Amino acid sequence: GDQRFGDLVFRQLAPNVWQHTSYLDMPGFGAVASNGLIVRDGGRVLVVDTAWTDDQTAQILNWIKQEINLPVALAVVTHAHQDKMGGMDALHAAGIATYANALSNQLAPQEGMVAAQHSLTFAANGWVEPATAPNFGPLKVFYPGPGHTSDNITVGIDGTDIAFGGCLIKDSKAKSLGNLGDADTEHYAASARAFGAAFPKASMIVMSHSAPDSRAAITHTARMADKLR
Amino acid sequence: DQRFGDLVFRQLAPNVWQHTSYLDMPGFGAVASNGLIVRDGGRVLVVDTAWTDDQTAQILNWIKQEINLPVALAVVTHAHQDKMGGMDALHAAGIATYANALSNQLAPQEGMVAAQHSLTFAANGWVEPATAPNFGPLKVFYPGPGHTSDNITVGIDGTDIAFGGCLIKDSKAKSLGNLGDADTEHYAASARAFGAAFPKASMIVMSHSAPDSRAAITHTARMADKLR
Numbered sequence: 149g150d151q152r153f154g155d156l157v158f159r160q161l162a163p164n165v166w167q168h169t170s171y172l173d174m175p176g177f178g179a180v181a182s183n184g185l186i187v188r189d190g191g192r193v194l195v196v197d198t199a200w201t202d203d204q205t206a207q208i209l210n211w212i213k214q215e216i217n218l219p220v221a222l223a224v225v226t227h228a229h230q231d232k233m234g235g236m237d238a239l240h241a242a243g244i245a246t247y248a249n250a251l252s253n254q255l256a257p258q259e260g261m262v263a264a265q266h267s268l269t270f271a272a273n274g275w276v277e278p279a280t281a282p283n284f285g286p287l288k289v290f291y292p293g294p295g296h297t298s299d300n301i302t303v304g305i306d307g308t309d310i311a312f313g314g315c316l317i318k319d320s321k322a323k324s325l326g327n328l329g330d331a332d333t334e335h336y337a338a339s340a341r342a343f344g345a346a347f348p349k350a351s352m353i354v355m356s357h358s359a360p361d362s363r364a365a366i367t368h369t370a371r372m373a374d375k376l377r
Numbered sequence: 378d379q380r381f382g383d384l385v386f387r388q389l390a391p392n393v394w395q396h397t398s399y400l401d402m403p404g405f406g407a408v409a410s411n412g413l414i415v416r417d418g419g420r421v422l423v424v425d426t427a428w429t430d431d432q433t434a435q436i437l438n439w440i441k442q443e444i445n446l447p448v449a450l451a452v453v454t455h456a457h458q459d460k461m462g463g464m465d466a467l468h469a470a471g472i473a474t475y476a477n478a479l480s481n482q483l484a485p486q487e488g489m490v491a492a493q494h495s496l497t498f499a500a501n502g503w504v505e506p507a508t509a510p511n512f513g514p515l516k517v518f519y520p521g522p523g524h525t526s527d528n529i530t531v532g533i534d535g536t537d538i539a540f541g542g543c544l545i546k547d548s549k550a551k552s553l554g555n556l557g558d559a560d561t562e563h564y565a566a567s568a569r570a571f572g573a574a575f576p577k578a579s580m581i582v583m584s585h586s587a588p589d590s591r592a593a594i595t596h597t598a599r600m601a602d603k604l605r
């Protein structure tokens with residue numbers, strides 16, 4: 149089940165994959181959750197997304213030390229919002245190499261985020277350029293197009309049932325997408341469907357703001373987005 | 378100004394011309410879109426197609442008559458019809474084409490033909506040189522999301538000119554025309570980033586207004602401020 153560790157929650161999703169969850173109180177609504185991933189790749193660990201804060205992200209590293217006890221080789225962060233990049237300092241303090249879409253790194257200062265140390269770029273078909281994502285092990289990074297934000301990226305976990313949609317995808321029980329002025333409401337639906345088509349064998353869809361769901365999360369999200377066009 | 382068919386050309390500098398093409402639309406009437414033609418030694422470089430293949434062919438035929446140098450390459454500045462509607466005409470003329478990778482990704486969704494090559498950008502917005510080989514005086518800058526997620530901009534080295542494409546409107550414009558693909562959170566910062574990337578440019582060229590001073594940048598950013 150869910151393992152509590154400090155103020156975070158960790159859930160094993162597969163033999164080599166865990167979901168990290170961190171919480172932030174907002175005005176009028178407490179304990180807004182955000183999820184990321186932790187992946188064991190042989191003798192190293194890879195992280196997808198920080199927690200909301202530096203202190204919480206340090207607790208992710210502490211949990212990894214206690215439960216996995218392998219070095220964290222790198223982290224990928226999936227766009228320039230606080231839930232995904234708010235804890236970059238904890239990673240850099242620990243010497244962990246960080247990667248984000250070049251556009252996320254360009255947006256980070258405007259958003260009050262610390263940029264990742266390396267930039268990912270993408271082919272016209274959305275797949276990460278290998279020269280920018282060397283030695284990513286099972287992390288298969290895909291840029292699906294603009295949607296939740298212009299910079300949002302997604303990550304398949306090779307060999308598992310799992311694909312991570314980040315904040316682009318919401319579960320099949322969602323009532324809305326959030327989506328604000330930095331959403332692209334013209335392309336959101338196609339971007340959500342492109343994520344599904346990029347990871348056609350994924351049966352467990354992991355998301356930032358919902359618990360894991362089946363592929364219906366992708367379809368339901370796309371159908372909500374269709375109505376915004 | 379000179380005419381070739383349905384196209385209008387205006388020389389802006391010794392080696393730079395603006396091309397203007399028109400598409401009839403309900404209510405608006407004829408809608409102008411501007412791009413650039415740059416003479417770089419023994420070759421010509423193009424920024425943006427016209428709205429259609431046939432209008433883009435008219436650009437190329439005017440170049441052959443007026444300049445009579447081969448067109449080496451074209452850069453197109455986002456995946457909307459005014460900027461990429463004529464890709465097939467460029468390709469049929471043997472012209473190598475370049476666009477933001479994201480523009481090429483969006484082009485099929487938009488009913489556009491993708492460029493042959495994709496540009497990618499550093500975290501500071503400047504094009505990665507390995508993706509923009511032999512661009513001569515064209516200095517390509519991604520200012521951030523604004524008019525669209527993929528909009529790019531181009532400065533012309535050796536001149537006072539910077540091209541804002543559809544991101545920038547002139548200092549008399551009343552609104553930005555933003556649709557669902559605009560990023561209204563970042564638009565203002567992206568407009569200002571374009572200005573800061575080309576801080577010495579005194580002639581700002583843009584898609585839907587005649588050339589203006591840097592007041593186009595300031596006014597665009599201030600209009601965008603109000604959408605946040």
Ligand SMILES: O=C(CS)Nc1cccc(Cl)c1
Nearest residue numbers: 174180229230231315326357
């Ligand atoms: O702050 C962000 C960045 S995606 N998201 C957010 C905020 C409040 C509630 C929820 Cl469900 C998501």
Ligand SMILES: O=C(CS)Nc1cccc(Cl)c1
Nearest residue numbers: 402405408457458459543585
């Ligand atoms: O169609 C496009 C793509 S940016 N722009 C357009 C359309 C109508 C009027 C104006 Cl002034 C610009």
Ligand SMILES: [Cl-]
Nearest residue numbers: 162163164165
């Ligand atoms: Cl596993």
Ligand SMILES: [Zn+2]
Nearest residue numbers: 227229296315
């Ligand atoms: Zn977000």
Ligand SMILES: [Zn+2]
Nearest residue numbers: 229231315356
């Ligand atoms: Zn989020």
Ligand SMILES: [Zn+2]
Nearest residue numbers: 455457524543
């Ligand atoms: Zn446009």
Ligand SMILES: [Zn+2]
Nearest residue numbers: 457459543584
């Ligand atoms: Zn336009």
